[PDB]
Paper text:
α-Helical coiled coils are ubiquitous protein domains, found in a wide range of structural and functional contexts. The structure of coiled coils is understood at a level unrivaled by any other fold. They consist of at least two α-helices, wound into superhelical bundles and held together by a mostly hydrophobic core. The seven positions in a heptad are labeled a – g, where positions a and d are oriented towards the core of the bundle and are thus mostly hydrophobic. We find that they indeed break the α-helices to form short β-strands, which associate into a triangular supersecondary structure we name the β-layer. β-Layers are found, also repetitively, in natural coiled coils, where they form regular fibers with alternating α- and β-structure, a protein fold that has not been described so far.
The observation that the T9 construct could accommodate the MATKDDIAN insert in two ways, forming the β-layer either at MAT or at KDD, led us to wonder whether the same could happen with the A9 insert, IENKADKAD, if the glutamate was interchanged with the central alanine to mirror the first six residues of the T9 insert (A9b, IANKEDKAD). We reasoned that the larger glutamate residue at the center of A9b might even be sufficiently unfavorable to move this construct quantitatively to the alternative structure, with the β-layer formed over the first three residues (IAN).
Residue numbers in the entry:
A (entry chain E), C (entry chain F): 1 to 67
B (entry chain D): 0 to 67
Amino acid sequence: MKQLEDKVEELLSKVYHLENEVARLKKLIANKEDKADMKQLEDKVEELLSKVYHLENEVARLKKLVG
Amino acid sequence: HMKQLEDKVEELLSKVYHLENEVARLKKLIANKEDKADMKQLEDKVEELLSKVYHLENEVARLKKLVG
Amino acid sequence: MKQLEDKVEELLSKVYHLENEVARLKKLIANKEDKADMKQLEDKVEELLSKVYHLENEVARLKKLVG
């Protein structure tokens, strides 16, 4: 009967520790970069490349005309 | 008292089940995280953009002065 | 006693396996990019997007004026 009580006690402690380890693991995971975030960043750079290209072309035409 | 212990194991049964589900959820989240990589390619593109934007700023300042 | 002891042993096996899974996930997590290490790239891109927005507006204004 002390045999069972001690097994249940081992289970209690190990469950409690696992709960804390999982809580820490989710905090760590939350601080990692999402694939979606990287994709957003790449698409913003693509947007910037395109806008800068158009601006260059626009500025070149303005420059000629102002002359 | 055996009932008290049964209730305790019932609690732990549920907690172990929840923990199994939390671990599977965390696996899925990890799969959607970006692997460490060399940032050279993205950084080089941003460096090109900052140079082009700097040069554009200078050009647009000149025109703004002339037109005004 | 026996039936409850067996249930407890079953749960100890599951907890044991879970501890190993968690150790393993910690290792996977180490191969992932830290969000904080992307902060500089992200901010630079946000700066550039604003600068390009303002440059576009100024160019369109000048163009209209000259045209």
